[PDB]
């Protein structure tokens, strides 16, 4: 076979240890999920906007009492107007307050006022993978593989808890002071036992079954991993067009072309992740995540060493001190106005 006796026994034992880990992780998650206003706005100085979206922004803030820096996501309650926008915001807070994994951002506080919802997370100063990737062009395969391995382990963890992530992309992956990944933005994450039906995500990263309005499962995350690995290694994603409608047509076609510099091992992995037929997509078969972890492209990956953060990272972001924002792009700054009248109080009672 491909493995000798010693290698096969080591791999098997490793897989049983994964099961043991995930069983304990589920017990810990459920405790926080079943039995979870830990601060207020004037406890922080607002420093700089780190990113912006349709419903709000993320700001670097400094806790007045302790001097610790944090990333504060601010959502305008009125802007959270559409039905699925509201439910998704409750998903995000509840999931972040219950998960625990080395590559998932840690939530520290959450609260709300008359106008906004707030989630205060650890500040990850190394910037988004997105801007490093756009600046360098593309990552070499070993560099892309180091990041991909962290996503594989993170999705193995999330999916074991029946959590789908649903917004993988370089914009949502921050690089920490040791060069490892922190997944942020859980706005589209959801606990799903089987199928779900919401049309959501980012166009370039949508699996065909989402676009086709089919009920779908956690395999959409494995498709998105294929898109991410391709984009990291090529510098652009596999389904690339100026308008969403054209992107969708490419995704559903079932056709992918690869740069001539992609290794054959990489192309094989990507053909099995970017698989329109769900009965054939890696991550969705009887062997689950192990079809990915045991693929030849990952043969050099020490999964436990990655989890334990023992592997030397390919890139360490420069940091000039606490509160440094040099690894983030600049954004238009807008005052945080809080109305004297409570908005949407009933819609956000649970937050």
């Amino acid at each position: 076979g491909h493995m000798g006796n010693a290698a096969a026994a080591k791999k098997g034992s490793e897989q049983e240890s994964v099961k043991e880990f995930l069983a304990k992780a589920k017990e810990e998650f459920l405790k926080k999920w079943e039995s979870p206003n830990t601060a207020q706005l004037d406890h922080f100085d607002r420093i700089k906007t780190l990113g912006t979206g349709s419903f709000g922004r993320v700001m670097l803030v400094k806790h007045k009492e302790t001097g610790n820096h944090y990333a504060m996501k601010i959502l305008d309650k009125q802007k959270v107007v559409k039905l699925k926008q509201i439910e998704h915001t409750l998903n995000e807070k509840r999931i972040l307050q219950a998960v625990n994994f080395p590559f998932l951002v840690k939530l520290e506080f959450s609260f709300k006022d008359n106008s906004n919802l707030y989630m205060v997370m650890e500040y990850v100063p190394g910037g988004e993978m997105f801007s490093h990737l756009r600046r360098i062009g593309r990552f070499s395969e070993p560099h892309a593989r180091f990041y991909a391995a962290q996503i594989v382990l993170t999705f193995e963890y999330l999916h074991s808890l029946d959590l789908i992530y649903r917004d993988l992309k370089p914009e949502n992956l921050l690089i920490d002071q040791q060069g490892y990944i922190q997944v942020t933005d859980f706005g589209f994450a959801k606990r799903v036992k089987g199928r779900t039906w919401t049309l959501c995500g980012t166009p370039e990263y949508l699996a065909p079954e989402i676009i086709l309005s089919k009920g779908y499962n956690k395999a959409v995350d494995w498709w998105a991993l294929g898109v991410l690995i391709y984009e990291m290694a090529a510098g652009y994603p596999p389904f690339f067009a100026d308008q969403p409608i054209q992107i969708y047509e490419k995704i559903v076609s079932g056709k992918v072309r690869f740069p001539s510099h992609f290794s054959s091992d990489l192309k094989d992995l990507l053909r099995n992740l970017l698989q329109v037929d769900l009965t054939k997509r890696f991550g969705n078969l009887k062997n689950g995540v192990n079809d990915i972890k045991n693929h030849k492209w990952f043969a050099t990956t020490d999964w436990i060493a990655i989890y334990q953060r023992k592997v030397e990272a390919p890139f360490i972001p420069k940091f000039k001190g606490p509160g440094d924002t040099s690894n983030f792009d600049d954004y238009e700054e807008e005052e945080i106005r809080v109305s004297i009248n409570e908005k949407c109080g009933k819609e956000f009672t649970e937050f």
């Binding site: 979206g53 349709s54 559409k82 699925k84 926008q85 998704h88 997105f130 756009r134 917004d167 992309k169 914009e171 706005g187 589209f188 919401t198 049309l199 959501c200 995500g201 980012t202 166009p203 370039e204 652009y236 994603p237 690339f240 067009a241 100026d242 969403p244 992107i247």
Partner: peptide, 14 residues
């Protein structure tokens, strides 16, 4: 190969 090079916004219901 024309496509979107800037930050990409997620879509909520379409």
């Amino acid at each position: 190969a024309a496509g979107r090079t800037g930050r990409r916004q997620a879509i909520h219901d379409i």
